Amino acid sequence: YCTLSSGFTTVDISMAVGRVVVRPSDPVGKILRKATFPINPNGSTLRCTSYSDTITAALTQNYPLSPLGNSIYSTNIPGIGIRLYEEENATNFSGYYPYTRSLTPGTTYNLAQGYFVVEIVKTADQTGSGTLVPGLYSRYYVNGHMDRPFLTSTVYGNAITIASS
């Protein structure tokens, strides 16, 4: 089981990608926009007691994996996918969302330094236009503390707009 530090506070990344222009010629699979957002650790920590304890990068929108796979998930916009990941010298705790990794008992864990990456991807020949649905897109949490993640990423309002020509 994991114990969170007193005053443990989630870091939320606002996924303010902006306007993403898509051209009919853009090929399926193209990263239409790679947006990088700063992750500012804040001193929150946790430690766990069991080899079965885990930290999980989970995707909270209910959209399925896109036909392309490779962690490119569909969105409410046809032909537009989204892929998330955290970008330091810790490959065991990096990778495309979603993933889950084992934690070492007794190790005091902090939110790692780096950047949160949002990739908007063309997943079909023709793309829709509009705004990605708002809300939580990801949470990075330990087992038993899904309600208090290290890190979340959230779309507010029309922070990500697709404009297909």
Residue numbers in the entry: 1 to 87, 89 to 166
From the paper:
We identified two virulence pili independently critical to A. baumannii catheter-associated urinary tract infections, the chaperone-usher pathway pili Abp1 and Abp2. Further, their respective tip-adhesive proteins, the adhesins Abp1D and Abp2D, make use of large, distally oriented binding pockets to adhere to glycoproteins like fibrinogen, a wound-healing protein important in CAUTI pathogenesis. We demonstrate that Abp1D and Abp2D RBDs are structurally similar, and each binds fibrinogen and other relevant host glycoproteins important in CAUTI and other infections. These proteins share a common binding mechanism, using a large, distally oriented, and flexible pocket that recognizes a complex glycan receptor.
We next inverted the side chain charge at position 86, creating R86E, to attempt to actively repel adherence. To assess whether the reduced-binding R86E mutation modulates the anterior loop opening dynamics, we crystallized the Abp2DRBD R86E protein, resulting in a cuboidal crystal, which was solved at 1.9 Å resolution (8 DKA). The electron density of the anterior loop is sparse, starting at position 86, even though the rest of the protein is well-modeled. However, we were able to model the R86E anterior loop, finding that it is displaced dramatically up and into the binding pocket by 11.6 Å relative to the structure solved for Abp2DRBD WT. Consistent with our hypothesis, the R86E mutant ensemble is characterized by a greater diversity of open and closed distances. R86E also exhibits an increase in the total number of heterogeneous conformations, indicating that this anterior binding pocket loop is destabilized by this mutation. Our findings indicate that the R86E null binding phenotype may in part be caused by the flexibility in the anterior loop in addition to the charge difference resulting from arginine to glutamate side mutation. For R86E, the electrostatic consequences of the side chain charge inversion, necessary to eliminate binding at this position, could be contributing to the flexibility of the anterior loop motif. R86E mutations in both Abp1DRBD and Abp2DRBD uniformly decrease the binding of the protein construct to each of the tested glycoproteins.
